[PDB]
Amino acid sequence: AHTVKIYDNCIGCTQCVRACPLDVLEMVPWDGCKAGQMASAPRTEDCVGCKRCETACPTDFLSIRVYLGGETTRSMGLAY
């Protein structure tokens, strides 16, 4: 489906999973940040790509990118 790629601009303020609808991203301990959190998206098969994390993403250029890819039932958000 969609391709989630995390920039190196992360501050770890958990804005992803707070905004994110179906919890695509996930906070993971990391050793190269101020707060110490990093966003990671294992369940990219279930990602829909609604692009609501780029709104809550603080950085000048956003830190969580999701490039538009293929479309499946998991990424169309349809109930049928």
Binding site: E26, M27, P29, T73, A79
Partner: protein, 124 residues
């Protein structure tokens, strides 16, 4: 398991829901209450855990987000596959995703510049 009663049809008896994977949530519900479904009107919440059927994943997570704002209750959502495969996709760590956990890993993570360079040096 005792589940809230809802009238109005719409949600049930859909062929697509039967042939497609379905979602099953639950909540503690220590007290009798009254809530609203993300796709229905109003319904009374009974004591103990309550199992429902959901056809979308966003429908399965918005209800948990709405429950967390009411009272403080741990949520459990289980995501079933087409045949009969039942896997715990929600809270596989059992730790809340925004909060920090010990079980850490990285999936699909490129550590390059910000303007672009879409090639990934290593997938794992």
């Amino acid at each position: 398991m005792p589940s809230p009663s809802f009238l109005g049809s719409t949600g049930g008896w859909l062929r697509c829901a039967e042939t497609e994977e379905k979602y099953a949530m639950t909540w503690s519900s220590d007290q009798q209450h009254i809530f609203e479904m993300p796709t229905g009107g109003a319904a009374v919440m009974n004591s103990g855990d309550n199992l429902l059927y959901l056809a979308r994943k966003e429908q399965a997570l918005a209800l948990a987000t709405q429950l967390r704002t009411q009272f403080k209750i741990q949520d459990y959502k289980i995501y079933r596959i087409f045949p009969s495969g039942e896997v715990q996709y929600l809270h596989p760590k059992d730790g809340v995703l925004p909060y920090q956990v010990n079980k850490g890993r990285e999936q699909v993570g490129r550590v390059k510049s910000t303007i672009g360079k879409n090639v990934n040096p290593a997938q794992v």
